[PDB]
Write a protein that binds this ligand. Structure first.
Ligand SMILES: *[C@@H]1O[C@H](CO[C@@H]2O[C@@H](C)[C@@H](O)[C@@H](O)[C@@H]2O)[C@@H](O)[C@H](O)[C@H]1NC(C)=O
Ligand SMILES: NC(=O)c1cc[n+](COC[n+]2ccccc2/C=N/O)cc1
Ligand SMILES: NC(=O)c1cc[n+](COC[n+]2ccccc2/C=N/O)cc1
Ligand SMILES: *[C@@H]1O[C@H](CO)[C@@H](O)[C@H](O)[C@H]1NC(C)=O
Ligand SMILES: *[C@@H]1O[C@H](CO)[C@@H](O)[C@H](O)[C@H]1NC(C)=O
Lengths: 535, 533
């Protein structure tokens, strides 16, 4: 120490850190990347809850992202930007429990509201180090303190033998919770306010946020939450104990392995062997379904997300929730025959009915026919364009839009302040075909402020749009209200209520208020389909 | 003695009456016996042809109304009373009426045969709304209407028995159709151009004649207004008919011969008094004694026969009014009245659904409620009221119509479809009821052309348009004016395009898909849900 930048040296509970001055378009930011928040969950620690990081000696270099948690790498369209943007950008390792902090430079003078990002990727993938999660624009433009953590995914994070000591399940969620605890203890060192912490995440990340809302030990660790295209309730975000046990014990067989013996044997297996087999344990040909996800354990989750949202008191909570225009389309090209990024994906009626079975894999025959009946345009029942778009809607509505509608409704009925959005702008830079619309995940780059980087080739309107979104999000973090307190001229974003069911459109035009989030179709999924299942 | 009013038919001579239509005179021959009075041992039996008569039979007056239940819900209210018998009740009621131009047509004229509705338990060809003079004067039509037995008298069945075979009210209709074939040329009618039209239960009757081979040689084209042979109310199975007749016989104090013989001893009103007590559930748009799938008149269910029939040489005009269900709500569903806005609660909506869809399981009724609830306005009483009407209308009329139209079109029939959306300015029902079941008839028959009735001038012009569609249809099987070169045209209904027209005060508008999404629920999904359960 002595010749370095004095404004980049910070101490946390575990010791000294040296960060890096990053260039954001408007000026410098401080980044502290690859901060360990847990003991490496390796060897005998695999499948186990994380233990806090033991203090280090000396100055830990925090200038580069750390390892990505061991994971499956999607190889469907090799070298295609649309798929590669989500793939690991650092070495895959089980030694991966590290977090990242961005702050203004120099660090804020007074306690600053903190945003904690939890990435998505089906609970089998993702990294806090991806370019779309770059906290420098929020830090620089909004003065935000931004934190993102890595958490264990796939088997390493979610393989459970429920009731066991050695693989109790949900440890990827405990990884996240430990980062939240780390922020509570340490964020003040960076100028962050531990008394104002907002969780935000997308897809599996948003399910994860919602699970922290529903899990008491987490509720002391944050104040507001944003759920983007994901929910703890719904068909994909959790599995019963029995189903987790079944999947884990099948995975075990598939790799050559009393839970103690089974688990001991799984711990002797190469990380890649587990990854190579994880996808093989799904009970049906599916899309938008993932092998190793949070388990209703009677611990982290004391009951099903459905039951917990229905009976919970959510008085002291503000939540921002929303969806993109086309939640389902991304998933079609990965498992539904007739669908491709490289053509118009105009499908036949036969391909529609096969796709409903894949998209709603838990459905009986009658339930599947109810879905088909509902989603068919009976004026044009064989029209390939309508069938393609209805297949998309089926998947989007079932997995995202209607779970989101359900969550916003239950939360608002029970005292939470809720704000709802539909994100409808398709990035001019998008590499997916037009038919896919505004796919799952393609709002993130705007919320994080990437269009502000002149080297990325977004339009001027997209720059301004991104700035708007950054304001909503940081205004919400700051106050639990995304509206500008100053700006009475701009259109206002009303809270979502059960009575009026209001939400706003997020696109290049000013905020437009709409009513009912697929109210008619979501009654099908949320009220009728359950009753039809049990019959 | 006016020679225009003297006609010889196979049974003998008839004397009709010169009636006045606003345009000029018409010849009416009313109260012509087409059958032996179905009295005594003939009760419940098929009709027999009327024996020849001596001298000149007086046909200047409507005959008696077939014995039936008279409605008492709103006594002396024109909206209910206009359907009530307007001549004396009698089992001796098998008579028919013929209007013709005056002087009678110079050349063979297309015949329209009206079959009234009234749920198979009521109705008469003598009601003012079925008055054939306007069509005869203005359109030059030969119009025929018959009485046919209704209620237990027309439809009580002990299927398999010789003496209560079921379907005799339909056999009455058929006999009148045979009468027209044998006799109509004497009035100037063309027996080679006969068009059946009817409404509600009369439209279902028309559809049954389409589905029964012996009837098919007796007509060439058909119009079904607000009713179909298929659907939840128009027919019962043989088992359910047997059970209903056995219950009724039990109720009045009565081996089939023995049971039927005892029923024939009972005064007519004793049967009517217990008619309504044999329904399996509390319901609306459900009727006690209706056509029975006997394996004879109906060789299979209307559903089976429409699915598998060959309808190549047939033209059909089918349609519905804007608010098929509203009428039925005041007759069984709590919270509904003509005397207020009938704004209902959610609880009253679920209860109404069990009554409106009486055959529904808990789960099926829940599907109905969930489909018809506006989830933006779940508890809005105006929405719940209109949805209740729609449930009844769709279930009983709109969706059966769409189903029939589609099967007929797919199987070779030339089909035209309409929705009728003009509410008479003279209607005595409240506004919330909209355009109720039955309230297009007065327009088709041309009553607005009568200045004394106080319809608006626009309604007279509209009634004239409709009379033209119906008679053009009768003449040609195409309702379009053959020398009207701007319109636009009324296209045939097909399964691909599903085109139908709106009939209102504005020019024809073509629409596609007659409640397509909702009727898929009723026509495709419900059958699978009830059966599976
Ligand atoms: C659209 O693409 C699907 C899969 O593509 C395979 O990839 C595409 C790009 C084709 O060009 C061909 O090489 C392969 O079939 C097909 O399943 C689907 O049928 C395609 N749509 C049509 C009819 O071209
Ligand atoms: N291990 C797994 O559960 C798994 C499940 C699904 N996929 C499929 O990859 C397609 N995909 C790619 C990106 C995001 C989600 C999805 C899921 N679609 O069902 C890979 C691994
Ligand atoms: N005998 C019967 O089945 C019966 C059924 C219904 N009503 C009540 O009249 C109401 N109504 C009046 C005109 C046309 C049909 C209806 C049927 N509503 O359920 C009387 C007798
Ligand atoms: C942006 O545009 C420039 C200039 O045409 C091009 O060379 C560069 O590759 C583009 N970058 C991206 C990320 O699209
Ligand atoms: C109107 O009258 C009906 C029947 O008498 C009654 O149930 C109700 O009080 C009124 N309708 C509603 C539900 O407003």
């Amino acid at each position: 120490e002595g010749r370095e930048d004095p404004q980049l040296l910070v101490r946390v509970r575990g010791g000294q850190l040296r960060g890096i001055r990053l260039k954001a378009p408007g000026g410098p930011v401080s980044a502290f990347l690859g901060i360990p928040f847990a003991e490496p969950p390796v060897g005998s620690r695999r499948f186990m809850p994380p233990e806090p990081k033991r203090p280090w000696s000396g100055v830990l270099d925090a200038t580069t992202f750390q390892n990505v948690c061991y994971q499956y790498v999607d190889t469907l369209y090799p070298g295609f930007e649309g798929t590669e943007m989500w793939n690991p950008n650092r070495e895959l390792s089980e030694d991966c429990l590290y977090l990242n902090v961005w702050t203004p430079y120099p660090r804020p003078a007074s306690p600053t509201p903190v945003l904690i990002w939890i990435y998505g990727g089906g609970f089998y993938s993702g990294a806090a180090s991806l370019d779309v999660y770059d906290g420098r624009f929020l830090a620089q433009v909004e003065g935000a303190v931004l934190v993102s953590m890595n958490y264990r995914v796939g088997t390493f994070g979610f393989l459970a033998l429920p009731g066991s000591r050695e693989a109790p399940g949900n440890v990827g969620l405990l990884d996240q919770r430990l980062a939240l605890q780390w922020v509570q203890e340490n964020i003040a060192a960076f100028g962050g306010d531990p008394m104002s912490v907002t969780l935000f995440g997308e897809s599996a990340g948003a399910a994860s946020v919602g699970m922290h809302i529903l899990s008491l030990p987490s509720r002391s660790l944050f104040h507001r939450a944003v759920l983007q295209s994901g929910t703890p309730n719904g068909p994909w975000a959790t599995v019963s104990a029995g189903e987790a046990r079944r999947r884990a014990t099948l995975l075990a067989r598939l790799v050559g392995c009393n839970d103690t013996e089974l688990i001991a044997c799984l711990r002797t297996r190469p990380a890649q062997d587990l990854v190579d087999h994880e996808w093989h344990v799904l009970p049906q040909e599916s899309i938008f379904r993932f092998s190793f996800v949070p388990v209703v354990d009677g611990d982290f989750l004391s009951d099903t997300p459905e039951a917990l949202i229905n009976t919970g008191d959510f008085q002291d909570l503000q939540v921002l929730v929303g969806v993109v225009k086309d939640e389902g389309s991304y998933f079609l090209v990965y498992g539904v025959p007739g669908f491709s990024k490289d053509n118009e994906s105009l499908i036949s009626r036969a391909q529609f009915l096969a796709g409903v079975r894949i998209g709603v894999p838990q459905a009986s025959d009658l339930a599947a026919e109810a879905v088909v009946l509902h989603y068919t345009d009976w004026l044009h029942p064989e029209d390939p364009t309508h069938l393609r778009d209805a297949m998309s809607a089926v998947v989007g509505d079932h997995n995202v839009v209607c779970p989101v509608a359900q969550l916003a409704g239950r939360l608002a009925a029970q005292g939470a302040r809720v704000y709802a959005y539909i994100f409808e702008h398709r990035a001019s830079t998008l590499t997916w075909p037009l038919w896919m619309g505004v796919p799952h995940g393609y709002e993130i780059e705007f919320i994080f402020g990437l269009p502000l980087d002149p080297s990325l080739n977004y339009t001027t309107e997209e720059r301004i749009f991104a700035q708007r979104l950054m304001k909503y999000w940081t205004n919400f973090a700051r106050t639990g209200d995304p509206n500008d307190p100053r700006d009475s001229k701009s259109p206002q974003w009303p809270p979502y209520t059960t009575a009026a069911q209001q939400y706003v459109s997020l696109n290049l035009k000013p905020l437009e208020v709409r009513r009912g989030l697929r109210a008619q179709t979501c009654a099908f999924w949320n009220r009728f389909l359950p009753k039809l299942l049990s019959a």
